[PDB]
Amino acid sequence: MKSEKEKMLAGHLYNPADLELVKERERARRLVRLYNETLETEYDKRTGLLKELFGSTGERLFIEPNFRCDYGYNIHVGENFFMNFDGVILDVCEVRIGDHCFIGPGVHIYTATHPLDPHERNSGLEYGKPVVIGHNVWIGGRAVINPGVTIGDNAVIASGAVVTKDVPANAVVGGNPAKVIKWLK
Amino acid sequence: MKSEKEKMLAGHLYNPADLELVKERERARRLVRLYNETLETEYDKRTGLLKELFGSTGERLFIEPNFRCDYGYNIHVGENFFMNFDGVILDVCEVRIGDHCFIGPGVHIYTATHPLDPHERNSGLEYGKPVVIGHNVWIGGRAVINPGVTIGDNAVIASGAVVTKDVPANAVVGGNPAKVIKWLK
Amino acid sequence: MKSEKEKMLAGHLYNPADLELVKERERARRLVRLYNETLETEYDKRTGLLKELFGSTGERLFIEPNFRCDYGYNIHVGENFFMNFDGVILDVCEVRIGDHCFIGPGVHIYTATHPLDPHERNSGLEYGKPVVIGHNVWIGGRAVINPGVTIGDNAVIASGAVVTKDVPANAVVGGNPAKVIKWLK
């Protein structure tokens, strides 16, 4: 019989008050606290903390504080990852990001969600849907990436865009709900 | 013969530079500073601080740092209140929230506003309009709730929604300005 | 024969990893760290730190922590400047703001941008376009102001608005992409 963690990772309904999940969120918040307190010149300390926090990385990555996440271990980024100030990644399920990603400030990436149904939501059970972002993606500042979304290679998300569905490779999308506004290839 | 505080709470034009109001904002920011500095495992200290800061609460509530507000005492939340990372509540007038509220990260709830007219606005005088949120409401991350809005029981605010008008009970709204996208239950 | 800083300020492609630019960014973050750590009652220290950080100011200005910026010296504000909690100003190029500005919380002002082509963007070279904001402007909470935008005197930006083009004087804009929704006269 599946644990709440197994249920969470599998995209099934789970209880976030589970003791194992609580311990793991406290661990993520501890590492995030240490991260957000580092000085602007402590690059090596920052790299080390991020490689410890995330599930996987490439050689190089840089994130401006403040940063926020749920678990840490569900975040997998490619080479030369960059995220500007005040980002939030709710990584209840996997968040997999490709190489040479540029993410602007105040960007929120969500895998966490609730049942829409009033009665179901009030159970207090939640679930997640993974987010996949390809290579050479630019996510404009203040964008919102919703659970279950896949963004294709070379795509561009306009600043302030609320992305509610998959974004094709080589597309620029913007607005809310975001839609294709330009093709690059 | 009304004080600036009395005019503020009544929804009339008032001067925020008023000494009494300045002191109360200083007090809110002090409690918010103490709150934001608490460690991820300091649940009891957090509960205590929020109960001191807010006008009223139910038995249990939890907010992820960072949190910001203006006064504290104008915020009234129901049972099992949860607000995720980096929320802002500008509580110049009352913000009343029902039970079992789930609020995502980076959500802003405003009761503070200015005159549209330039001379009127440069008077420097401001005003407020209260916000009322019902029971079993889910406010998606990065939503904006404007002054004067009432959100009905069971409603869902999509991530990134900018809510400019009342939301019926059992409706799902999304967009900017938010509109009804479906009905529930 | 131009330095990366000279290309940056002139709106040309530049490399942010330039040693001079890195030094200058570290200075800005240092001063921003000192600013964000100030207590709610340290008004004089706050005023001094902002006049050090910014390119130019009027007599009086106040920003609620947290604040973020890239360089500081490209930010020029007019008399009686106010910015609420959790603002971000990416001042790769000049951000010039007039007198009596009220900026709500969580507002993002960008001058930094990337090429749309992924090979061109993957060069890692970036560029900037200045933002100009007139006098007596109200920027609603959670607005996003994109590079190259000019906002006219007495304009009002609705909360949550994503401003992708110039805003006429005496106009109210709202939405994403923002459009004029009311003329003030």
Tell me, briefly, the overall form of chain A: globular
N- and C-termini, Cα separation of chain A: 48 Å
CATH architecture of chain A: 3 Solenoid
Greatest contact between two chains: A-B, 27 and 32 residues
Could you say what the CATH topology of chain A is called?
UDP N-Acetylglucosamine Acyltransferase, domain 1
Q: What is the percent of helical residues of chain A?
A: 10-25%
Q: Would you list the SSEs of chain A in sequence order as H and E? A: HHHEEEEEEEEEHEEEEEEEEE
Largest sheet of chain A: 7 strands, mixed
Structural class of chain A: alpha/beta
In total, how many beta strands of chain A?
Answer: 18
Protein name (chains A, B, C): Maltose transacetylase
Pfam family, one (chains A, B, C): Hexapep_2
GO cellular component, one term (chains A, B, C): cytosol
GO molecular function (chains A, B, C): maltose O-acetyltransferase activity
Note down, in words, how this protein is organized.
It is classed as transferase. Keywords: structural genomics, southeast collaboratory for structural genomics, secsg, riken genomics sciences center, RIKEN Structural Genomics/Proteomics Initiative. Three copies of one chain form a homotrimer. Chain A is an alpha/beta fold and 185 residues long. Chain A has a single domain, classed as UDP N-Acetylglucosamine Acyltransferase, domain 1 (3 Solenoid), CATH 2.160.10.10. The first copy, chain A, is 22% helix and 28% strand. Chain A is built from four helices and 18 strands. Chain A has helices at 4-9, 19-37, 43-53, 118-122, and strands at residues 61-63, 67-69, 75-76, 81-83, 87-90, 95-97, 102-103, 108-110, 112-113, 127-128, 131-133, 138-139, 144-145, 150-151, 156-157, 162-163, 171-175, 178-183. In chain A, the strands form four sheets. The first copy, chain A, has a seven-stranded mixed β-sheet. Chain A has a five-stranded parallel β-sheet with strand order 2-5-8-13-16. In chain A, helix 2 (19-37) runs antiparallel to helix 3 (43-53). The longest helix of chain A is centred in the N-terminal third of the chain and has 19 residues, at 19-37. Chain A is globular, with a radius of gyration of 16 Å. At the A-B interface, helix 2 and helix 4 of A face strand 17 of B.
